[model samples]
Target: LHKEPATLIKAIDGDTVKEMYKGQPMTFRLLLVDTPEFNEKYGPEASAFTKKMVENAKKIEVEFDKGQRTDKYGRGLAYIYADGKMVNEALVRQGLAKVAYVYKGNNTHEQLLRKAEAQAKKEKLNIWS
Candidate 1:
C-alpha cells in the first residue's frame, strides 16, 4: 500500500475501483465502506457520483490497513485518497456510502467514516432518504 503509489483509473462503483499501482493494474475495494450495488436502488446514482469524484481527483493514493491485503477475489482492500482527502470518507459524508465492515487497527479512519455515515443518516441524505 505504501510501497508503490497508485492512481485512480476508474470507479466501478461507490466502493470499488480500478487503479494503477507502480505500473500494475489492480482492483481496489475501498476499505470499511460499502455503497449500494450497481443494480440496486440508487446504485447508479452512487456510482455516477463516485465516478465524478474519482475523475475530479487532484491526486490518488492507496493505503492498506493492518489486516488483509486482498479479498478472496484478489482485489486490494485499501483506503483511497483524492487530492489529500480520503475518498472513503467523502462518500460516507455525502450519503452515498455506508460504513459496513470494520478491520482491526484501522479504527482511526473507520471512526471518521462511521461518524460521517451517522451524520448522513441523521440528515437523511441520498440513500438514507
Candidate 2:
C-alpha cells in the first residue's frame, strides 16, 4: 500500500520521523544504515536534504521484497520510491545511508546499492561531508 507524503520531522543519526501520514500515524525508519550522528558527521545536511526531497511528498509508494511485508515493529520495511526514484537507494548513493543488507546473501537491491555507497564513500559526500 502507498501513503501520502508527510512532513519530514527529522532524519538524523540513524533515525527518521515524519509527521502523521494519512491520519494514520508518524512514519520513518531506522534504515539498514548508520548515517552520521546528529552532532558528528553530515547529520544536518543529510537531514536537510532528505527533508527537502521528502517533505510533503503527497504520493509516496512503498514496496516490500519477498519475505517481509512489515518489519516486526510494524513500521513497515519498505522501499520508498518518490519522483521516479527510490528514496532508500538514493540515500545510499548520497552517503547518508549505508547499504543495509541483513544477510547480504538474501539481499535485495544490494549490488547497485553497494556501488552507490562505494561511490559516495569515495567522494566523501554526506556523512563523509
Candidate 3:
C-alpha cells in the first residue's frame, strides 16, 4: 500500500492495533504475520516489539491485500509501514512473529515473508531462539 496519513494509536497485541486515519479511529491487523496469542509464551515480547516499532516510526502507512478488507472481527487487514519498512515483515525478520494467515490468491508478500522466516530461524532470533 502507498503511504498515507495515519497514526498508531495503540498496540492491541502483536498483530492487532488501533490507529487514527484521517481523524477516524480504526482497528488494524497486520498482514502476512501472526504473533503468538496474548497469554502464550513470547506473546508479550511480540507485542512489545510492535509497540516499539510504532513509537519510533517516522510515519505510519496502511495498505490492504487482495482479500477482504476486513476480517470477521471487522479489523482492517493491512500491511503497516514504519520508518520506510514494512512492519509485518519486520516482525517475522526479528523472529517475533511468523509468516501466516495466507489466503489462496491473496498473498502479496508471501515470498518475502517466508524468506525472512527462514533467515530468522537460521539466526535463532527472538522466538526462533
Candidate 4:
C-alpha cells in the first residue's frame, strides 16, 4: 500500500489520531497496536509519547492494512508513519504498546511488530515488568 499523507489535528490517545487526510477530517487507529486506555497503568506516558511523535514529526503518512480498513465507527485503521518510521512498531519497542488485534494469519508488518515486542519484553520494559 502506498502512503497517504496526513496533517495531525490532535492525538486522541496513545494509539489513535484525529487528522486531516486528503482534505477530510478523520480519526485513525494504529493497526495491530494496542496501547492502554487513559487511567490504565502507563497510559499517560504512552499518550505523551504519541503526542510528541505526531506533533513533532516533519511528515506523517498512513498505510492501510490488508484485511480491515475501519471498524464500525468508521475510523481509519493503518500503520502510521511519522518521520519515515512506523509509530506502532516504535511504541512496542519502547514498551508503551504491544502488538495486538492480529487475526487469523499474518497480515502486513506483523513480523516487524512481533520482533519489537520480543525485544521489549526481554528487556523487561515498563508494561512488560
Candidate 5:
C-alpha cells in the first residue's frame, strides 16, 4: 500500500501505523516472519500502532511477494510495499516486527531486514525500550 502523503501514526514492536493516502486501510504482514505472540513482548502495542496508522486513509494497496500471496486464512500475505519502499522491512527494522517463519526460497531480503531489526532492538526501539 502506498500512502500518497506518507505519514506514520505509531510503532510498537512487530506492528506499525502509518496512514495511506486519503482514507484507505492498510495492513502489513512481514514476509517469512513471525514474531512472538501479541502478549509475548511487544505484540499488542505493535498491532495497535499499525491499526492507529490506518485509522483513516485515502487508499490502500496490497501487494504480493511474487510467488507468495494470501495466507491460509485468506488474508493477503505479501510483503507490503508502501509508497515504493518495503513497509514489512521497515516494521522489522523498527523492531515492530520479527521474522515470521523461514521457508524454502524465503531468503529474499530476510537477512538484511533481520539485521536491521536487530539494530532496532539494540537501539531500544519500540518494545525494546
Candidate 6:
C-alpha cells in the first residue's frame, strides 16, 4: 500500500471523510466499506465512532491500493489508517459498516476486511442485529 500522511478536516461518516492532503481539502471515499448516511439507521452511531478514532488519532495516513485513486466525483479512494489500525476493517468488525464498493486490483486489504465482517455477522452487532 502507498502511504501518505493527512489531517482530518471532517469525518463525514464511517466510510467517507474530508482530509487535508497536500495542502488541498480532499474527500476520501473509504475503500471497501460503506457506512450508513446521516438520517439513516445507525448512522449517528457510526459517525460518532468514526470521529472518536479519527479526531483522536496521533497520526493519520491514507493508503492506496494498486488501482484507481479517485471515485466518480473525484473523491480520493483509499484506506484510512488510524493509530496503526485500519479504520475500514475496524468499522466492519464493529458492524457499523459493510464491505462494499469492491473493485478488481483494489483489494489489498480484502482478506483482512472479510475476516472482520464475518465476525461481525457472527456477533450480530449493530448492522447485523
Candidate whose TM-score is highest: 6
Off by over 4 Å in 4: 104-106
lDDT (Cα atoms) of all candidates against the true structure: 0.83, 0.59, 0.86, 0.89, 0.54, 0.90
- The global Cα lDDT (0 to 1) of model 5 is 0.54
Clashes of 6: 0
**Stretch of 10 with least lDDT, candidate 6:** 8-17
Q: What clash count does candidate 1 reach?
A: 0
Candidate 6 TM-score, C-alpha based: 0.95
Instruction: Please list the residue runs of candidate 5 whose C-alpha ends up more than 4 Å from where it truly belongs after superposition.
Output: 1-29, 56-59, 127-129
- How high is each candidate's TM-score? 0.90, 0.68, 0.92, 0.95, 0.59, 0.95
Q: Model 4, residue 66: what's the lDDT? A: 67
Worst 10 residues of 1 by lDDT: 1-10
Instruction: Give residue 18's error in model 4 in angstroms.
Output: 0.5
Residues 15-121 of candidate 2: C-alpha lDDT, one tens digit per residue = 35453455565555633545565676677766665666665465455545555544556664555556646676777888887776455323466676788888999
Question: What does candidate 3 score on TM?
Answer: 0.92
Best by lDDT: 6
What's the true lDDT of residue 3 in model 6?
78
- lDDT for each residue of candidate 6 in 7-117, tens digit (9 for 90 to 100): 999988868889998889999988999999878998999899888899999998999899998888999999998988888999999999999978996988988999999
Comparing 1 and 6 by TM-score, which wins? Answer: 6
**lDDT, residue 43, model 5:** 72
Q: Mark the regions of model 1 whose C-alpha exceeds 4 Å error after superposition.
A: 1-4
- By lDDT, the candidates rank as 6, 4, 3, 1, 2, 5
Which sequence of candidate numbers ranks them by TM-score, best first? 6, 4, 3, 1, 2, 5
Of candidates 6 and 5, the better by TM-score: 6
Better of 2 and 6 by TM-score: 6
